[PDB]
Every structure is written in C-alpha cells, then in structure tokens.
C-alpha cells in the first residue's frame, strides 16, 4: 500500500496526471537501458539508488514473460490462453512502463528537470489548444 | 541480472540452502511490517508491491474465467512456485536488518558444511544464529 516514488519525491497521482498512452514502449526502453549502461546494470556498485530500483524492476518483466511462456506451453484451451497472455502483456505493463521512464529520466537528465517537466506537460495538455503555445514541451 | 551480487551474495550460494528451509510468505510478511514499517530498505518496498500485484492477479482470475478447471492451473502456480523466490528474498533481506551481515555470511557458509556432513556424522545440535 506504499508508493515507490514517495521517498524520491514523486507520487502516483502525479504520474496519473499525464495521459496513459504517452509513455513509450517496453522493448524499446529495455534496449535503450541495455545500450546505455550494460556495465552499470551488471557491475556491482554501492549506492546508485535508481540503478538498484531498475535492477529490482526488470525482474518483474522477466517473471511475467516466463509465466507467458508457461501459459503458452500449457493451458490447452484457446479461450483462456488468449485472455491470460493479453493481460500479462498489455494491461499490467502500464505500471512497469511508468517506473522505467521515471527512473531513466533521473539518471540522464536529472530529477529536478523531470519533476518540473511532469507538471508542465499536464498544464499544457489540460488547457484549450488554441490558447497554448504551438507544439509540446520538449523533454530536454 | 541477479539481485544477490550487489550485496556480496551469489545466487548459487543462496541456492545451497534447501528449498524446505525457507519459511512461508504469510509468516515472513507480518514481522516485516510490524517491526520495520518505517539502501536495502527499498528492495523490501519493491518486493511487497510485487506480492500485492500477484495477489491482485489471483482475485481477478477468480472473478472471471468461469470454467472451474482452468482456475487451479494458475492459482497453484502463483501461490506455490512463483512465490519461492519471494520467500527467499524477504528472508535474505530481513536477516541483513535484524542481524549483522558479517554474522550472516558466516552462518550461510557453515550450512554448506552441515549438509555435506553425512547424516550419520551429523552432530546432535542444530546451527542457530542466536
């Protein structure tokens, strides 16, 4: 019943403020992280809190795709198989998608920038289009 | 790739313990909140959320999937096989907070000698952390 972001300064409602579809894809993000820091994600380093959070998070995706594969092998009935795989993939992935983007933001562009950009994007989307600046706020 | 490396632990070392040794999830959970509700601390935050999300999957499965047969396949899996890693992780992390790391590692290593020793030559005592 705890919010992972509370200690870092963010909150679940703040993330819910932005549209759901805005967040990037899963495989892309994973590839981005691997290309970025294979050493960091593999090498043991003290402190590095967001890296420790990333390590812990990736295990969720790994375990979920292992259960997708298990469902693929077993559970002969087509009807249940499609429902279970579809939930394993699309429905639950939103929280993971949010966690990875939030963390990656802090590592590359800093926490102050991502925190200030989160509210600004919501501000820009919520008001009428005509009276807002053209275009959308660039990350950095 | 493996949680245990950063904390000076090996997945092989951690596997050296037998499966039955780790306790159940329900019991381990209670002490975690009551005594430590307040770097390692985060890992617990993540693990509790993981278990909560699985339990949430269980109830969703229970509500739909009207076929009685298919329920057990997933329910037993998530409540037995999926949770062994959770049982391992909670104990491994809690030990760090409750007792010292230096004592912990020495405890872990000696258990290997204990299992290696034949049952015939196993001493009458049970190695306890104290």
């Amino acid at each position, epitope marked *: 019943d705890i919010d992972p972001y509370k200690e870092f300064g963010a909150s679940v409602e703040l993330l819910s403020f932005l549209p759901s579809d805005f967040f990037p894809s899963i495989r892309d993000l994973l590839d981005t992280a691997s290309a970025l820091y294979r050493e960091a994600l593999e090498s043991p380093e003290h402190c590095s809190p967001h890296h420790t959070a990333l390590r812990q998070a990736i295990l969720c995706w790994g375990e979920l795709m292992n259960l997708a594969t298990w469902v693929g092998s077993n559970l002969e009935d087509p*009807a249940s198989r499609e429902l279970v795989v579809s939930y394993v993939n699309v429905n639950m992935g939103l929280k993971i998608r949010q966690l990875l983007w939030f963390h990656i933001s802090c590592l590359t562009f800093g926490r102050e920038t991502v925190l200030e950009y989160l509210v600004s994007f919501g501000v820009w989307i919520r008001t009428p289009p005509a009276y807002r600046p053209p275009n959308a706020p660039i990350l950095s | 790739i493996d949680p245990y490396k950063e904390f000076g632990a090996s997945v092989e070392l951690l596997s050296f313990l037998p499966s039955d040794f780790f306790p159940s999830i329900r019991d381990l959970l209670d002490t975690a909140s009551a005594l430590y509700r307040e770097p390692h601390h985060t890992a617990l935050r993540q693990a509790i959320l993981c278990w909560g999300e699985l339990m949430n999957l269980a109830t969703w499965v229970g509500s739909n999937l009207e076929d009685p047969a298919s329920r057990e396949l997933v329910v037993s899996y998530v409540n037995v096989n999926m949770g062994l890693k959770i049982r391992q992780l909670l104990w491994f992390h809690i030990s760090c907070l409750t007792f010292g790391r230096e004592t912990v590692l020495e405890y872990l290593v000696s258990f290997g000698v204990w299992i290696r020793t034949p049952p015939a030559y196993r001493p009458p005592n049970a190695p306890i952390l104290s």
Partner: antibody
Amino acid sequence: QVQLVESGGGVVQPGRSLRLSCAASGFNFNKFGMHWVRQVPGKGLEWLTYIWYDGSNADYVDSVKGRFTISRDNSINTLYLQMNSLRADDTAVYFCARGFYDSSSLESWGQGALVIVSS
Amino acid sequence: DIVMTQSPLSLAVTPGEPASISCRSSQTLLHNNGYNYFSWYLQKPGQAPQLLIYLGSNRAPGVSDRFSGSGSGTSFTLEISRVEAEDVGVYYCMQGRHTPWTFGQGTKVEIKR
C-alpha cells in the same frame, strides 16, 4: 442448466445433401467450444469434428475428411454442420454437445436428431 | 491415431455387490500439468449420455457417490460399490490427449439370470 434443441432432421433422398440445425442458449457461446457426436445403430459413440471459439481452426476424422464442414455464426449463437456426398454408411442420429471441464470431456449433451437415407 | 481398449465386454452383477471395469489406452495421458485426460460416460436406451467421472479421478457434479474410480498413466478402473436397479446401461471411456478424439468399444451391464 443449459438447454439445447436441434432441428432439421428427417429423411433425405439418396445422392443429395442435407444440413442440420443445432441451436443453443443460456451460456456464453463465444467462450466455449462445440463438438459433433454420431451413433449408427449397433455400435457406440464416434467423434467426428470440433471447432474452436474463433473458428479459425478446425479438425476432422479420416472417415469424413474433406467432405464435411462446420461453421458458427456468433451473431445468433447457432451451430451448423453441412453434409455432402452422403453414403449408406452415414445413416445415424447426430448429437451436438459442449465440453468445459478444462477442454477435455463433453458436459451437456443435446437431445439429438436422426438422419435416414433410402429410396 | 490412438487405439482404445475396454474389458470385460459384459458383466452381470447381482445388485448390492461391488464390481470393477477396466479401460486401457495405448499412449500415456500424463500431461505436464500433472493431470490425465480420461473420461467415464454413462448411456441409457432412449436417452442422451451422462457424465460419470471427470479429469480421471474427480466426480462430475451431481453424480452419486456410489461410483468411484482412480488410476493413472495407461491403466484405469471404474468401481461401483453397490449396484442399484437404475444402474443398468452401457458404459464408455474416451481419450482427449491428442486430436482426433477416439472412443472405446463399450461395456453393457445386466442382471445375472
């Protein structure tokens, strides 16, 4: 309890083709599969074919392979079995059933209808 | 593809005594879920078939406890503790491991004259 009623059974002249009617109600047709069972007098049950909920896949036995076809219309929740190239060995009563014990054995069986061919 | 087999073909039972019938299958039915796909059906003259045992060793809903069965792998047996006058019929066993589905040969019961 679900109740299924068939229709369209009767006598057919030799050499022609006939189509049988098997409609169902009281449960989610889109969430379960259907099967066809046949019984000529003197022998026991024999499996013929089945279709999955989507209908993309289907299977057939070698006795009637390539000469029978099955299709479903989820709009009205009605089964369909088409018969062509009927023979004297095909004179039997036909049953349509549904299986839901984890996709293995049929659970509710319809009343069935008999098909007879002769001159 | 699967060859089914049943035995004995006939068995007349004095009612109130136990009896056992055996159905055998060629290929193993133990899937990777620890379950065995085997069936027990009951058929009555002028009536539609009815279920006896499901999933190998679980009783179908509403079926009386007078019928029980067990077994695993390639061997199974149907056991009836007490025979009642309404138990007369022809029994069947079926396979659902691999498509296409195959049925047995049948077993009809009666009263010893």
